[PDB]
Amino acid sequence: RFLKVKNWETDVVLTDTLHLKSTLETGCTEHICMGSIMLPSQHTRVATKDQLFPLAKEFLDQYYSSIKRFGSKAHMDRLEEVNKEIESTSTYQLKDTELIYGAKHAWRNASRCVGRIQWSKLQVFDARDCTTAHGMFNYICNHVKYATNKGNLRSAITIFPQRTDGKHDFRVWNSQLIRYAGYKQPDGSTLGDPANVQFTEICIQQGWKAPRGRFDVLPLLLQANGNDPELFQIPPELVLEVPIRHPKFDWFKDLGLKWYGLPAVSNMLLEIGGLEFSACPFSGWYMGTEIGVRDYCDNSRYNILEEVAKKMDLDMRKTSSLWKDQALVEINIAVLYSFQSDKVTIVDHHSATESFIKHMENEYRCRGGCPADWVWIVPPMSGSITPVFHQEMLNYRLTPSFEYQPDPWNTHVWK
């Protein structure tokens, strides 16, 4: 088919033929839709040689087709050359160019990502020569420094060697390079970030000297070629942080919150031409809601709506006073304010969602489509006053892609 998606705020219509090239499955059948299951058996990530050539063939056929050298001799030699090498070694290696293309297009194809207008502006750091945890720590530190750029943030990805057998496997055990620690208390309450409490304990299991407080930058746990991971502390000077004040409430400093500048997802798996990159941390800059709404106000995250309402002196008795809503807008005004007053790159959820629509336009004109996940594109506050609420989005799974993968501490055969 050649499906149509509509915007109901603007009566704009686009036509999607890109979904035809789609390959992977979604979890939805004809009789059930599953667009709200968080981690489906599809989106989560062992492969053989027979399976491997079509995936190389397909990938190389789009990559040459993109530089305007489709199916020619430079193409067919390269198809022959990897075909041969996949006979010989049963796997193969990517040209430096094929890696940059594959990486940028895994982001371009990430349907849950609102910020994809910047997909082509991605710095690829090739760390396929890495052998040790120390080498990983060094590539990662150089990633942080470059991406952070003293607050003028830049998108980057660092790609450690691809999985081979499966038991020799590079992994960053952190879910993000920079996260705050999470400790449980005597009464059972939680200090820091409740999300990471299990991870924080694994780091103490391996000998972390926790400064058992709130915003405690976790160390890195780096697994190299299947070996047992090792702890490393990012130099504090390389960890940029923003203290959250408000442009009205002088008591907002007293709240005493802060966040890190650099969102940098490290636990994902990067698929290119059938090869699997189990360590591939990637970074950009924050949309405000990801801190102000989710990090700070999720019930099982920092859960600050309590204290902020109290200090605003709010009708906190009734549910229908909307005191939760009132304090969520102020918390998000203060996150934005703080970040921009410190020259640290941040986008508000209005600006970013307007850009995604602009982006969808381009993707539909110059590519014939753009897979998008409305459940995840719409910002977690003020949904319908942002234009993506009113935009129909076809979700489908293209490749190259980022995929979820099981946490290594269940998989990793220890020793």
Add this chain to the structure above:
Amino acid sequence: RFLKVKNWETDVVLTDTLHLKSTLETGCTEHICMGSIMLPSQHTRVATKDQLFPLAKEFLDQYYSSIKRFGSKAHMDRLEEVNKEIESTSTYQLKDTELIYGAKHAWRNASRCVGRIQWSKLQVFDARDCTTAHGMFNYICNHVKYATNKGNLRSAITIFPQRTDGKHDFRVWNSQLIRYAGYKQPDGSTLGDPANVQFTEICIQQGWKAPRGRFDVLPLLLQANGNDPELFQIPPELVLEVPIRHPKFDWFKDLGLKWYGLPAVSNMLLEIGGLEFSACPFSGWYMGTEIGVRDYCDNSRYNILEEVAKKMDLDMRKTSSLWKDQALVEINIAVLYSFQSDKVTIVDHHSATESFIKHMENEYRCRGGCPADWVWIVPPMSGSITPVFHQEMLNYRLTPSFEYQPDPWNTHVWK
């Protein structure tokens, strides 16, 4: 299968086997998901006699199974009796009991409805004896009065005769029984409600004396047995309205807004046992966001975020001041306040979404499932601070159901 849905705020898991009894299709394939297309060719509504018996059989098999008389003689006689009548007339008629059951279960199965905890408490008004537009006006007026109950709102539905040939067809041309008018201006701007401007013109086409202002209660356009529709004005005393003030801002009265108490969708189609009820207006009470967020603040609806921000004296220059968000919480505090201070039934979006989770529990315990549409369940503001943001929902199409249908003024062969 026997699928599992998770809540990620509470780590609660439910098992869904109800989807197995599902019948209709959703629009999603294995390779595409379409859970964000507004009106899919599925959800929109001509049927023959061969098709008709299985649908009667299936419906009667669940209805007797519910009163604890599954497949017995009272059952088999009734299956024989409608089978015979479907031979004879090629259609059939529903027992008063089968109509109440079918109606309540069309609501129970409406996966986009957040308020379904009250599905069993539904007043069914059987208007299948109606022959004229005047009879329709009278059934509808009695609906409004009963449902409104002087602000203590009650759920009701009024069911005009089922479609037969297709060209003799009862329709309420209004989309809701009570809506405000929409007129265009000289400069092209819009007074009233821009949604209805086409409808408002059709009513003036048929001779409405528009009081060309804002909150102008539209007249009813009633089509009876295929005949050309006729205009009727609900008695003003039967149209309950709530003037919107704020519990801080004395200037909020000066804004000069008001809304009607009774949400009452009239343009839907009710499917029961294979029979199609083209006129079936149904009502309950409002969730606040439906007025404060969508009606009042949609760009192509009343679009009041401008004036409210101005009066709050807001940093309206930058996008990232979040002035749009700030004025949306106040507008929604004032809608709730006003409605409850006037003893008119209204639910806030926190209260209603907590109830839907409680409801989902019951539906999964005592029925094995509950189809839900996350795109439409999550409230259009403060999504993630309400528990339905964190709840995975399987969407699937059961029957009896409400279905969309084309507007009659394109279909109706005039004269």
